[PDB]
Amino acid sequence: ETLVTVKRIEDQLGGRLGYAELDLGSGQVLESYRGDERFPMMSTFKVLLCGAVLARVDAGQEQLDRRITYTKADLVTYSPVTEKHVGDGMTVAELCEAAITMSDNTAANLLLTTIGGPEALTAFLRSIGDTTTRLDRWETELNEALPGDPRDTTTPEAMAATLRKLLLGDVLTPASRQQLIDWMEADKVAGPLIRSALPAGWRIADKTGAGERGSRGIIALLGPPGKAPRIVVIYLTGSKADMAERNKAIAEIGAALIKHW
């Protein structure tokens, strides 16, 4: 029934929907829709970015408390946290927390610089066995979502697989792994999406994205109280829906996969 709901929403909104739900013990796909088609990641890439940063922290190449200085000229659109700290700068950890929790765009660009740019993020991903996902541009041009454009894209199944390696696998140390989950648990801007459908006792760690051409997405580690969690990723692109419609669609898919857990 969840896959029926997905198809009906895609029929209703236009554009394309992508969906993957992953079992964590085996890493096998429980169900997916357009699971091997490419979708723009938008800000959902910011979790992979912070994984790359934490990987450098783990290797002694970076410190969570190192202060990055920047000016007003480095600010791009939608920088709710970094725009308040042009004066005193921010630490690597504060920038990650801003990038994940508020989806601060300058925070992501600042972190991208620390690792060597979008090409270095893609190389990090290749190094951990993701041969599909790719980041090519900076904020905010990576949100352009041109039809057919493979730049800055993932597939629902590949993003699910990579998130399992990062959040539960051995890419990171347990301390850094949990740091990443903790930032995603603290997501502030995902309220109208899967969180709006969560029954009491459920836990979620998530990250949203939004882009041009009606694009929206979410990646999430979630589970019922007392039970094992799963990973879900949902992308949509190519419709004329506004943010609220995009939010509703994702929440409706969340409610269906929750009802059919």
Author numbering: 28 to 238, 240 to 252, 254 to 290
Excerpt from the paper describing this PDB structure:
The TEM-1 β-lactamase model system has been extensively used to study protein evolution. β-lactamases are a class of enzymes that are produced by bacteria in order to provide resistance to bactericidal β-lactam antibiotics through hydrolysis of their core β-lactam ring. We apply EVcouplings to computationally design variants of the model protein TEM-1 β-lactamase. To examine the structural effects of these mutations, we obtained X-ray crystal structures of designs 80.a, 80.b, and 70.a. Aligning these structures in 3D to a published WT TEM-1 structure (PDB: 1XPB34) revealed that all three have nearly identical Cα backbones to WT TEM-1 (0.26–0.61 Å RMSD over all Cα atoms).
We also searched for local structural changes by examining differences in all pairwise distances between residues, which showed small changes in a one looped region for all three structures (positions 255–257) and in a second loop of 70.a (positions 53–55). Both 80.a and 80.b have 55 amino acid substitutions relative to WT TEM-1, of which 80.a has 15 mutations in the core of the structure and 80.b has 19 in the core. In particular, the 80.a and 70.a designs had between 4-fold and 32-fold increased MIC of four tested antibiotics as well as 24 °C and 6 °C increased Tm, respectively. The 80.a and 80.b designs also had a 4-fold increased MIC of aztreonam, as well as a 16-fold increased MIC of ceftazidime. The two designs that were optimized solely for predicted fitness (i.e., distance unconstrained) both conferred resistance to ampicillin, with the greedy optimized sequence (opt.a) having a MIC equal to WT TEM-1, and the parallel tempering optimized sequence (opt.b) had a large decrease in MIC (roughly 100X less). In summary, nearly all of the designs were able to confer resistance to ampicillin including a design with 84 mutations relative to its closest natural homolog (70.a) and two designs with over 50 mutations (80.a and 80.b). To investigate the structural basis for the increased Tm (80.a had a 24 °C increase relative to WT TEM-1, 80.b had a 18 °C increase, and 70.a had a 6.3 °C increase), we tallied the total number of hydrogen bonds and the number of atom pairs in contact (1.7–4 Å) in each structure. However, we did observe literature-reported globally stabilizing mutations such as M182T in every one of the designed sequences, which has been shown to confer a 7.5 °C increase in Tm as a single substitution. The 70.a, 80.a and 80.b designs also showed increased resistance to aztreonam (80.a and 80.b had a 4-fold increased MIC, and 70.a had a 32-fold increase MIC, see broth microdilution assay in Figs. 4, 5). There are five shared mutations near the active site that are in three designs (M69A, E104T, P167T, E168A, E240G) that may contribute to this increased resistance.
